């Protein structure tokens, strides 16, 4: 009297990407090749900022100008996996058995 | 027979040690395999993967050079306990905590560990300067007081090996240290690390002295209790071990002298004077070569021991 | 405006509170235990949020800013690891308890 | 405070960022910011 | 490098005990690729046992940390000084490893039945270095307050000797050592001849202390006492002469021996799965 | 059951795990994703270990807040608002009074040292370090 075995299942990863996501609505993506040879970003606002002439005799705000800039982020992120040496010492051989 | 043959022709060919060159100005397919390293990194696809040889097993090989991996040391610390604007290459200390089972460890910097022996009485102003509250670092050390006065820290402290990667981690700081093997840097650029010593600290023990030149100069670390409290001078020296502990003794036989006169060994525990360890070996032509530590507004002098090789030791007692 | 306190023997520089609760927190404490009080006692932490309502708002989201409990445990304790402990908390932003 | 002002060809926007500027550059929104009256607010020498 | 080592010999018992100890290191003969059922270790030193002989053995043959184990065979890795290994601290007295400690390899203390596995595979103690000299002292200074009260009953209390002696407390951790209440007299046991060892150390030793002040400053005068400083000066030559080598040879060799002998060193402990990411030094 | 001369006034805290609403507006920031770099980082004889590395680095290009986070719903409350007052036994372990057969009458008498297992917090302790649900300090 036998011990059947059913079926063996697995389940298939599905693949998930940024861009593929409605995440990505939130922010705009560039593929930059080389991001560990840069150590610091840089974008510069200039805000030239209109202003009402008063007749009321005020001390009167000439014409400004803001420069704010906004220094870029770095994340850096990092898993580990694992590989065992014997399923490395077979992957670097050539078999002729079955 | 002829599958051996096949199996030893690739196990045959040893490193090129040798090459006769004609000229250097034609820069051969040969001199250029016998120049090429492997590197340890790649891009995550399988063409980079199978030309950097990280797949191959025991050593990196595209398809035993003197070239051995490091290890790394990876430390789960407190985040107020380490400052992240230190050097990347400076040696670190481990204090074996008395509690069982906590998940946070206690690492120390030279200048981390010197406020530990100040408090209770240059670096000092930088010590001062870049851990603004000593007492976060008096209780990572549950009985310091108590623990230097029966002279059984050197015990307590392990050598971890320089840092080299240290993710700014907020509640619970993570910092990757070389606890033995070629320091090198883990960084997507490969860059060198350069061992830190503050200099104040940083004692040499080849020009104390003032025609044998030996290739190797290690590095060593002395905690030694004093009257004023404990000590960290870093001594670099060209000979072993058996040598490096005899001309220790001479070196501190004054200070034997002192705590055996401002002091009395009343007790069995006093009469130990200190113990040293070796950090490492570094190469004796071109080592210590010395640079500065410019934080915020103040700048020590430090000294930077380039292409170390970090390999720590228990131990060895000075008396 | 009519009264200066409801309490003098809490609401004061050196009084009965500021012996017990008015203790610098830190992560390498013996007990690390989590009093709810500290958050209303520590002078380090009552001049923490001197600083611009932007900055101050900044600094409200971008961290853990101040005195978290931790969850799912027995007995509350103030956080160490912070990895996968994200909470927000207003009891630290305006000082007052319901 | 951590800002440079060259005579940098501007690409010309037309996001409402005018909007709660002087008030949020005051309470500091903003990490480093030059705010330029006058006759700073100029195309500055090369 | 080729670092198997394929030893060839067990039925199902005897496996399922081998697989209990799959992942501990044992020591080999010899550094060869197919070797014998005897070539592994302390089966032919420990089996009366003294303790210098097994340290002997210890420190002088080549170790292995095994890895699988076959109904014939059992695939074991030799360890070299080059590379780096992966144990597991998988012993009966059980010691919490932790990160960064120098690992010793001492031979079996705390009895034959808590390390072997008789098919007789007799592994060693694997244990760190400041547990390995903690209960070194506390089983020689057990072996020594033992051998006063078989000598003398007055002397020592044993309840006195095993308040001490049989605990140990290293990073907070508790342990309680099975120590051998009756040792058995003229020797017969383990330990027998190292704690006669340094009885020999310590009475030859005021006979030499003052044997080099007189030969050959003050300060080391002063923190012995003025009696065993002063204390004979008239001895035979040729018996001083012998009694200075044979003190000499019990004073190099039993330091050797405190240095712990075989020294491995783990970087990365991990007790969610036992495994310590060692090399040897 | 008499009242003494003080009256006391007790603070607690309430961990309420809510499920926040995270807005993000369309191209706030601009994200500079970098390649992923494979580094081998233990080569130990029995499993070598690969550590996948990847670098991102963003740069909001607005000037004021461009999100917003709200709680949509109580999922639960976790601590019971209830009635655990921590003991200062525990707190400050090294206090004590002058005489100690008085010491063992008060923690006699109140609940001192009721537990002493866990003395900081249990996610930092290892593997292998009360039936309700965490138990909310009440603070006199």
């Known amino acids: 009297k036998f011990e059947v ?70 994340h850096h992120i990092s898993t580990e996996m694992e590989l065992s040496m014997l399923d490395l010492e077979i992957l670097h051989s050539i078999p002729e058995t079955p | 027979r002829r599958r051996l043959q096949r199996r030893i022709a690739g196990l045959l060919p040893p490193p ?16 250029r395999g016998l120049v090429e390293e492997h590197a340890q990194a790649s891009s995550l696809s399988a063409a980079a993967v199978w030309r950097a040889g990280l797949l191959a097993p025991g050593e990196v090989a595209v398809a035993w050079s003197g070239w051995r991996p490091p290890v790394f040391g990876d430390f789960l610390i407190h985040a107020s306990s380490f400052n992240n604007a230190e050097a990347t290459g400076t040696p670190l200390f481990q204090f074996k905590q008395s509690d069982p089972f906590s998940g946070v460890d206690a690492v120390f910097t030279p200048l981390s560990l010197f406020i530990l022996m100040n408090h209770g009485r240059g670096l000092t102003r930088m010590a001062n300067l ?46 990757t240290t070389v606890v033995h093997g070629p320091v090198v840097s883990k960084a997507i650029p490969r860059s060198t690390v350069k061992v830190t010593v503050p200099q104040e600290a ?25 009257e004023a409290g404990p000590r960290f001078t870093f001594f670099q020296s060209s000979r072993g071990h058996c040598q490096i502990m005899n001309i220790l003794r001479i070196y501190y036989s004054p200070s034997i002298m002192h705590r055996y006169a401002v002091v009395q060994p009343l007790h069995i525990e006093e009469l130990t004077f200190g113990a040293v360890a070796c ?23 430090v000294v930077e021991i380039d292409s170390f090789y970090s390999n720590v030791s228990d131990w060895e007692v000075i008396l | 405006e009519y009264r200066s306190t409801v309490n003098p023997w809490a609401s004061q520089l050196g009084s009965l509170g500021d012996i017990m609760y ?8 013996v007990p690390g235990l989590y009093s709810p009080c500290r958050a209303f006692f520590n002078k380090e932490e009552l001049l923490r949020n001197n600083r611009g309502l932007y900055n101050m708002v900044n600094e409200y989201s971008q961290r853990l800013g101040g005195h978290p409990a931790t969850s799912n445990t027995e007995v509350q304790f103030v956080v160490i690891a912070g990895t996968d402990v994200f909470l927000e908390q207003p009891c630290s932003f305006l000082q007052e308890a319901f | 405070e951590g800002v440079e002002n060259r005579p940098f060809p501007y690409l010309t926007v037309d996001a409402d960022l005018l909007s709660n500027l002087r008030q949020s550059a005051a309470e500091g929104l903003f990490h480093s910011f030059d705010l330029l009256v006058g006759k700073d607010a100029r195309e500055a020498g090369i | ?95 919490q490893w932790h990160g960064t400690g120098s690992l010793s390899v001492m031979p079996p203390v705390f009895g034959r039945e808590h390390a072997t596995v008789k098919l007789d595979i007799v592994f060693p103690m694997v244990l760190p270095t400041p547990i390995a000299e903690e209960v070194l002292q506390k089983i020689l200074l057990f072996n020594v307050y033992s051998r006063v009260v078989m000598q003398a009953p007055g002397n020592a209390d044993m309840l006195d000797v095993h308040m001490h002696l049989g605990s140990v407390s290293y990073l907070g951790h508790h342990y309680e050592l099975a120590l051998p209440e009756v040792p058995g007299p003229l020797g017969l046991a383990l330990l027998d001849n190292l704690s006669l060892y340094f009885c020999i150390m310590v009475t030859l030793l005021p006979r030499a202390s003052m044997r080099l002040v007189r030969g050959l400053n003050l300060f080391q005068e002063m923190v012995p006492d003025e ?23 019990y004073l190099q060799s039993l330091a050797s021996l405190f240095n712990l002998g075989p020294r491995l060193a783990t970087a990365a402990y991990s007790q969610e799965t036992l495994t310590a990411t060692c090399w040897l030094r | 059951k008499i009242h003494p001369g003080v009256a006391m006034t007790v603070v607690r805290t309430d961990e309420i795990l809510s499920e926040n609403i995270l807005f993000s507006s369309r191209a706030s920031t601009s994200m500079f994703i970098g390649t992923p770099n494979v580094s081998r980082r233990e080569a130990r004889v029995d499993a070598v270990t690969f550590e996948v590395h990847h670098e991102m680095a963003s740069i909001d290009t607005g000037l004021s807040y461009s999100s917003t986070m709200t709680p949509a719903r109580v999922a639960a409350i976790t601590t019971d608002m209830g009635i655990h007052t921590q003991d200062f036994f525990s707190v400050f372990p090294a206090e004590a009074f002058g005489n100690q057969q008085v010491n063992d009458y008060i923690k006699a008498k109140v609940g001192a040292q009721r537990n002493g297992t866990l003395l900081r917090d249990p996610r930092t302790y290892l593997a292998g370090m009360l039936c309700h649900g965490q138990q909310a300090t009440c603070e006199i």
């Open chain 2, 279 to 301: 950090l490492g070996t570094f190469s004796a032509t071109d080592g210590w070569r010395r640079s500065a530590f410019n934080y915020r507004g103040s700048s020590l002098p």
């Open chain 5, 1 to 95: 490098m080729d670092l198997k080592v394929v030893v060839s010999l067990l039925y199902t018992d005897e496996i399922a005990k081998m697989q209990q100890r799959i992942g501990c290191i044992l020591p080999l003969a010899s550094t060869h690729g197919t070797q014998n059922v005897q070539g592994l270790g302390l089966g032919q030193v420990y089996s009366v046992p003294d303790y210098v002989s097994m340290y002997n053995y210890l420190s002088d043959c080549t170790l292995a940390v095994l890895d699988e184990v076959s109904v014939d065979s059992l695939i074991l890795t030799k360890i070299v000084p080059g590379q780096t290994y992966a144990i597991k601290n998988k012993y009966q007295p059980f010691f």
């Open chain 3, 22 to 29: 008015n203790s610098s927190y830190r992560q390498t404490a």
């Open chain 2, 202 to 226: 940083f004692v040499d023990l080849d020009a104390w002295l003032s025609q044998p030149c030996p290739a190797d100069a290690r590095l060593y670390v002395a905690l030694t209790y004093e």
């Open chain 2, 130 to 175: 870049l851990y603004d509250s000593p007492a976060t670092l008096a209780d990572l050390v549950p009985d310091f007081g108590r623990l230097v006065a029966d002279r059984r820290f050197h015990n307590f402290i392990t050598p971890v090996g320089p840092l080299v990667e240290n993710i700014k981690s907020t509640y619970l700081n993570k910092i």
């Open chain 5, 227 to 249: 009696i065993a400083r002063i204390d004979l000066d008239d001895l035979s030559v040729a018996d001083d002469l012998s009694r200075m080598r044979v003190m000499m040879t």
């Open chain 1, 5 to 74: 075995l059913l079926g063996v299942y697995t389940n298939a990863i599905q693949y998930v990407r940024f861009l593929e996501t409605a995440l990505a609505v939130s922010c705009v993506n560039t593929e930059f090749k080389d991001l560990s040879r840069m150590t610091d970003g840089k974008i510069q606002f200039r805000i030239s900022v209109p202003t009402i002439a008063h007749g009321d005799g005020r001390r009167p705000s000439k014409q400004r100008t803001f420069i704010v800039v906004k220094n870029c982020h770095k």
């Open chain 2, 16 to 31: 090129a040690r040798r090459l006769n060159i004609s000229r250097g100005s034609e820069f051969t397919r040969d001199v």
